Ligand SMILES: *[C@@H]1O[C@H](CO)[C@@H](O)[C@H](O)[C@H]1NC(C)=O
């Protein structure tokens with residue numbers, strides 16, 4: 001268990017002792033955790049067997065998994081060639097959300113040149129290596145290793161087949177009327193004002209694993225329709241994952257990569273209730289492709305402050321938020337349906 | 339939010355930053371928290387109005403509530419008499435579980451001698467002040483006050499009528515495969531071995547408030563029948579509140595006061611699986627009223643290590659656990675049905 005000390009402003013006290021500590025590692029720019037294959041030689045053999053099985057490539061679950069592949073790929077290919085394996089691993093850059101894949105790597109056993117055959121990691125959708133023949137979520141943390149600068153997390157091949165996110169790195173807690181669902185890439189923050197509802201969400205990236213019921217507060221009496229963050233995008237089945245006047249945001253800007261969700265106004269914009277406004281549709285950005293600002297938005301039955309996305313490209317409103325004045329084709333809209 | 343540093347053996351790392359810390363305050367003998375009425379003068383007027391409305395007395399929710407009454411009672415009665423009110427508060431000692439009561443104190447306004455009329459706090463069941471005419475769970479934490487030695491918790495009268503435990507003091511969390519539901523009196527520990535299941539529970543006292551769904555992990559797909567700690571005794575509606583081969587322990591030794599639940603063998607006893615054994619019945623103690631030890635127990639479909647209670651009087655086995663050799667009347671059995 002965890003032993004330590006902390007300053008709780010809410011209870012206006014400083015306390016020390018055993019218990020459980022949930023940290024915010026999504027805000028920290030530094031990667032305080034790092035992934036490492038348990039064995040490089042074994043992993044090499046896994047892929048050729050994966051290749052043998054007819055697997056063209058792989059899709060990482062998260063940026064950190066993606067990053068892991070980036071560092072090891074040289075070492076893998078060198079082995080692959082010194083072993084004499086024809087295959088060579090290609091790690092393709094991933095921008096946007098990390099999608100899932102039906103195939104899974106199988107557990108077995110108990111500088112670099114170009115090469116003839118490729119194992120493709122991530123990147124865009126290709127007909128060369130369609131996702132239907134790619135692996136995903138095939139690894140899990142066996143244990144941790146002490147790191148001076150960064151905690152080491154040793155991965156291993158999953159024996160079971162799941163869509164569930166790795167439980168180990170998940171931290172979930174509620175105290176002093178603050179409720180948190182978190183992992184290394186997700187920080188979902190809900191608070192008790194007048195009521196309990198979603199307030200803040202930060203996603204280093206968007207991923208398509210599923211969130212465990214075991215690590216889910218308020219999992220009873222669930223309407224999937226009311227879940228802001230969709231289940232298929234690793235949204236937790238919680239009644240914490242809700243806000244009055246909003247539904248599932250299946251058409252949010254998920255393919256933008258980093259997504260910051262909160263309830264406020266997009267800079268220089270206005271949202272207002274109106275029955276003359278239009279019904280929910282794809283999340284729209286305030287700035288258009290030209291960059292023009294859109295001042296007047298509306299919504300029918302949403303609450304205020306309004307659902308807000310922040311993205312490298314700009315900021316977006318929720319699906320229920322619609323432009324007061326615009327024709328629809330002219331603006332940037334999320335093309336994600338999940 | 340909480341800010342601090344802690345040593346996580348599981349992840350073999352030391353980390354510092356913002357987040358959420360759940361402390362084990364049920365193990366600490368010292369009362370790092372203390373209850374205080376927001377206003378003694380107001381509280382006095384509350385009771386006489388309660389008395390006026392026909393409220394004979396009160397039942398505390400927890401030992402800490404009970405303790406609050408103990409310290410304040412002199413000061414109350416002094417006021418009550420210096421005010422000239424006929425009523426005086428009698429705080430009766432509470433041993434065993436803290437039961438609920440239908441009446442609630444109403445919020446309003448915006449050394450000591452004996453006396454003629456009494457307002458009774460806790461104690462045994464009386465026909466003089468039946469529980470049906472007593473108050474319970476009428477107060478809640480408004481805010482905290484910094485204390486050097488002990489954190490101050492200021493109470494206030496609840497406007498809504500609930501059976502729910504006070505959310506403020508609740509800490510619930512799961513990390514590194516340790517799941518905890520806790521408050522100032524309850525420490526419920528479930529761990530991930532082969533599976534997720536209950537492992538440890540420590541109750542300073544037993545209370546009849548209800549555990550909030552909002553602060554409950556794994557609250558989906560609930561069979562109330564399988565919940566080890568019953569709902570009616572602030573048992574969390576969690577699939578963490580379960581163990582294979584066991585059901586609701588409605589007839590556990592709850593009226594003993596402090597109850598420590600775990601899975602092991604009661605000192606000098608043996609539990610074994612047998613179809614010849616008997617069906618579930620009232621939790622029985624290993625030592626009889628004489629003190630005689632009972633070596634041989636059995637169970638039908640329970641798992642091992644067996645469900646174990648530890649109590650000041652002695653140790654007890656779970657309901658599914660039965661004596662191998664005994665006649666039933668001869669032994670100490672819980673007389674609690676909840
Ligand atoms: C790829 O295959 C060709 C066969 O035509 C062979 O000449 C070449 O050496 C191979 N490359 C590697 C890196 O094995």
Ligand SMILES: *[C@@H]1O[C@H](CO)[C@@H](O)[C@H](O)[C@H]1NC(C)=O
Nearest residue numbers: 419422423424451452453454
């Ligand atoms: C109790 O009532 C009697 C009435 O006969 C009165 O004399 C006495 O002063 C009362 N005591 C208090 C403490 O009010």
